[PDB]
Ligand binder design. Structure first.
Ligand code: VZG
Ligand code: VZG
Lengths: 251, 256
């Protein structure tokens, strides 16, 4: 399971942003700089999907996976106490640095992300929310940590799942295979300097794109074109394993 | 000398704060993020002291010294175009984080500052305005396995061009011999160490100009820092006799 944190051990500081049904803050854990993921007032099935994320992340240990200190229950709020990463989300940094991010830097990120996902695949564990926003920069060569997936994908509404297109695996709209799709969509996002395909488009348009099984663009980066195309296949069984992806990233 | 920047190359944005006879803004250099230090409408001796700072900064290169892109003349305003440092002034950060700044973090800052000042000392160059406000944070060093990373800002309008009233406002950072040499920077460094140790709460800073001046006139000494690893260092730096102050070579060696 996960460690229980008393509210006396933590101090809530600046607001960093928002997640699905959460508010993200900087904080202190009694001293360590932490990140506090404050769950909105929620029903037991939502809080349970949040505890399951805490449980999963507490039972894993990988260099490219962010640490989870535990969970604090503060009135109607569930707080996941997590590792603070220096430079924050990758997507934000790619947009600020657009047109000035070298291809070699992007390959380092891809390799490190595939390493974290290969580790989870071998343990038959699913992340379910691979995207640039969940990729944290510990070092700007770069060093990443994949964040916890927040509230589990299984507990969200159709509307929330449509909002996650193109990162959301198509089989999830109506298995470790979903993370191959998430990984492929993240590679496109990285290649396009944080500008993911379909992100501006309406929910109806995003859903229609998946319903007709239209395919996402080929990345402008040629070394990742075959990889993304193989990952972004509608047939989950047709997606390469992370062992294969990781092996193909060394060459 | 320094690079001349045309006004067509720059964009002025948010106000960051004020310096001695300046207004500090975020801006853009054609599009690079920069800091623009806008000199007030001034006398030629003040513009000259500002050009000398730009000249000095343009001829130096060190990892813990902030970069100066050049100067723009627009038109009764002189604009120094400088490097933008992510987290800004150290003194502001120390006050926000008061009581939560570890000693090991403070020692890193001290070594990086002494490294920048040792480089200037070897080149016989004087900064003249070492204080927490001129120490900029490029990296915070809050995460485990990470260290702070500082950039010492340009000294702005030169100390020699300011009024006695402006020099009294600079106590306790201002070297006492400057009230009526590279030695002044050893005093500035010592006063900055006290400020860092006291989480951005420098001694005498609340006190009146009369009190501050009297403190120097009577040659009263500044307090010993609450941090024991820097007590001997600060006491040696904060000596009224400029020749009695240790060299940055000695200070830097003693900090390792
Ligand atoms: C384990 N630690 C962390 O996650 C973390 N660590 N360090 C930092 N540091 C800084 O920001 C440094 C710069 C000060 C930040 C971090 N988290 C973080 C910050 C802001 C928003 C989200 C967010 C956003 C969206 C979602 C979500 O629902 N989707 C579907 C993506 N979820 N969360 C977030 O999580 C990814
Ligand atoms: C080389 N680059 C810079 O100086 C600089 N870079 N990045 C940032 N970033 C942020 O603020 C990030 C956080 C948004 C800020 C910067 N500096 C800056 C900002 C505001 C006021 C002063 C100031 C104040 C006082 C004096 C002065 O008179 N004395 C006597 C010391 N002088 N200047 C200042 O200069 C030290």
């Amino acid at each position: 399971s996960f460690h229980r944190v008393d509210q006396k051990e933590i101090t809530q500081l600046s607001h960093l942003g928002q997640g699905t049904r959460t508010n993200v803050y900087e904080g202190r854990l009694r001293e360590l700089r932490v990140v506090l993921k404050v769950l909105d007032p929620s029903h037991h099935d939502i809080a349970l999907a949040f505890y399951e994320t805490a449980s999963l992340m507490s039972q894993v240990s990988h260099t490219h996976l962010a640490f989870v200190h535990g969970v604090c229950v503060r009135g109607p709020e569930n707080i996941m106490v997590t590792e603070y990463v220096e430079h924050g989300p990758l997507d934000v940094w790619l947009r600020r640095e657009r047109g000035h991010v070298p291809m070699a830097w992007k390959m380092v990120v891809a390799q490190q992300l595939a390493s974290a996902l290969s580790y989870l695949e071998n343990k038959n564990l699913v992340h379910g929310n691979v995207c640039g926003r969940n990729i944290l920069l510990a070092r700007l060569s770069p060093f990443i940590k994949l964040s916890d997936p927040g509230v589990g994908l299984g507990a969200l509404s159709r509307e929330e799942r449509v909002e996650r297109i193109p990162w959301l695996a198509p089989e999830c709209l109506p298995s470790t295979a979903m993370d191959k799709w998430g990984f492929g969509a993240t590679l496109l996002e990285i290649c396009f300097d944080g500008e993911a395909p379909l992100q501006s488009r309406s929910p109806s348009e995003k859903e229609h794109f998946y319903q007709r099984q239209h395919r996402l663009p080929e990345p402008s980066c040629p070394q990742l074109a075959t990889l993304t195309s193989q990952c972004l296949t509608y047939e989950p069984t047709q997606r390469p394993s992370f062992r294969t992806i990781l092996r193909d990233l060394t060459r």
